[PDB]
């Protein structure tokens, strides 16, 4: 019954001092509800879930002001990080930022996080205590000394332990019909002859929420990882997710294999057979 | 989003 809220930020500079592309997204669990794209015409935070559209105009103005300040901060960071690593203006570089909070089934604070990355590599991250930093390299150590003197950790701790949790509860209440739900996976199995001596069984899991799920193949009731292929959990586009797992079996022995499905929306673990 | 603790590197 635990939940989470996360905010993702990306700023990608363009070649030759090109102004960055800025995209921000907000998630409640596995559900996106807000977005900001610097290439969009509105230049404002925009709703992506119905339960967030019931907020007032000052909510959207305030979120727009804060997210624009993020982009302007990343715009300065891209120039600063270009000097820290002695890089030229010809290339394109990326700043990523992610923070959020987890609450347990009692909706009480569980943990907070705030992570920063440059060109896909860890840069600086707030430790689990929300009081000390982890600097990946020497450039981030300079940033740590600046952020420690500016008391950034206690400011983020107040947001992660307070504002993040308080507004996560408000979201879980306003959109309880869609956020406090679990979609049990609808499952089926496909068969494909590979050669004269073997075939492929593929176990399907469709239209489930949240995205967390485990698919396990079994031969004679025993877990099997050999000759198996897992695919990454993917979105269906309607708010639900999909995943499949495959296994190559000897021809004529398809009936000896079972697919085990584990999902928090199922009232009981699910077992599939080729039929 | 955060209204504090967002500082330049």
């Amino acid at each position: 019954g635990s939940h989470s809220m996360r905010y993702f930020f990306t700023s990608v500079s363009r070649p030759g001092r090109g102004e960055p592309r800025f995209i921000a997204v907000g998630y409640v669990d596995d559900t996106q509800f807000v977005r900001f794209d610097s290439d969009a015409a509105s230049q404002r935070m925009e709703p992506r879930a119905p339960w967030i559209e019931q907020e007032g105009p000052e909510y959207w103005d305030g979120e727009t002001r804060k997210v624009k300040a993020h982009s302007q901060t990343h715009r300065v960071d891209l120039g600063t990080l270009r000097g820290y690593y002695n890089q030229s203006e010809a290339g394109s570089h990326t700043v990523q930022r992610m923070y959020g909070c987890d609450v347990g089934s009692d909706w009480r604070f569980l943990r907070g996080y705030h992570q920063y990355a440059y060109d896909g590599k860890d840069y600086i991250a707030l430790k689990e205590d929300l009081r000390s930093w982890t600097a990946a390299d020497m450039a981030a150590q300079t940033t740590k000394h600046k952020w420690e003197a500016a008391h950034v950790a206690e400011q983020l701790r107040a947001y992660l332990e307070g504002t993040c949790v308080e507004w996560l509860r408000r979201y879980l209440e306003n959109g309880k019909e869609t956020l406090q739900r679990t979609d049990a996976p609808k499952t089926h199995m496909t068969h494909h002859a590979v050669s004269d001596h073997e075939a492929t069984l593929r176990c399907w899991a469709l239209s489930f929420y949240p995205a967390e799920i485990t698919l396990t193949w079994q031969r004679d009731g025993e877990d099997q990882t050999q000759d198996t292929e897992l695919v990454e959990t993917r979105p269906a586009g309607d708010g639900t997710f999909q995943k499949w797992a495959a296994v190559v079996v000897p021809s004529g022995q398809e009936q000896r294999y079972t697919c085990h499905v584990q999902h928090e929306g199922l009232p009981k673990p699910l077992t599939l057979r080729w039929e | 989003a955060a209204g504090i603790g967002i500082l330049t590197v």
Epitope: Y59, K66, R75, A150, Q155 | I6
Partner: T-cell receptor
């Protein structure tokens, strides 16, 4: 004014308790500040508070209640140097730091 | 620290005036206020970072520029007697943090 304080002027004798409150309209505000200003001088910060609850610093106690959008400042053992104009500041997102009427 | 200049000015109506404000504390956010009796401080313009500005509560009649991190001047395009006030510059580490104010400018516009 999107930020309002209790109307003055207020008067308290030395050694007594002084109390000032402050309300704001933006429910999503995340930082709140109490400033002190002497006559013909610059605003000087007394305390800041981010989270709900009480925050004590010497003779000063600040209280924040986001649900009721309410900020207050309690001054114990009022000193002659406490005589000033007290300014409540609330950040409405970004660099939109809005003050009260004092 | 943060310094503000000039600290006193008398302006004829219609003249243009620019107040200086410089800050060497490596602060990103800078602010401009005016103080009037019964209204406290009123946000004129602000700047989250170097290179960006934003309108406050009383933007009309004023303009700013933030070419770099240090400087954040305030310009009165055409002086109006209603712009007679006390102006305060201020800066903070980032948006949402505590502002440090300058000395203040007493400015009177007369017809």
């Amino acid at each position: 004014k999107e930020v309002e304080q209790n109307s003055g002027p207020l008067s308290v004798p030395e050694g007594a308790i002084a109390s000032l409150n402050c309300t704001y309209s933006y429910r999503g505000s995340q930082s709140f500040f109490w400033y002190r200003q002497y006559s013909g001088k610059s605003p000087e910060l007394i305390m800041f508070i981010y989270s709900n609850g009480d925050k004590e610093d010497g003779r000063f106690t600040a209280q924040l209640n986001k649900a009721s959008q309410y900020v207050s400042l309690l001054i114990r053992d009022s000193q002659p140097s406490d005589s000033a104009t007290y300014l409540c500041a609330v950040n409405f997102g970004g660099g939109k730091l809005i003050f009260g009427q004092g | 620290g943060i310094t503000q200049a000039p600290t006193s000015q008398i302006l004829a109506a219609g003249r243009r005036m620019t107040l200086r404000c410089t800050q060497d504390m490596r602060h990103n956010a800078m602010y401009w206020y005016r103080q009037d009796l019964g209204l406290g401080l009123r946000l004129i313009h602000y700047s989250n970072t170097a290179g960006t500005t934003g309108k406050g509560e009383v933007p009309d009649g004023y303009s700013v520029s933030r070419a770099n991190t240090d400087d954040f001047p305030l310009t009165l395009a055409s002086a109006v007697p209603s712009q007679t006030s006390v102006y305060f510059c201020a800066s903070s580490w980032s948006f949402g943090t505590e502002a440090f104010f300058g000395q203040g400018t007493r400015l009177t516009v007369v017809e």
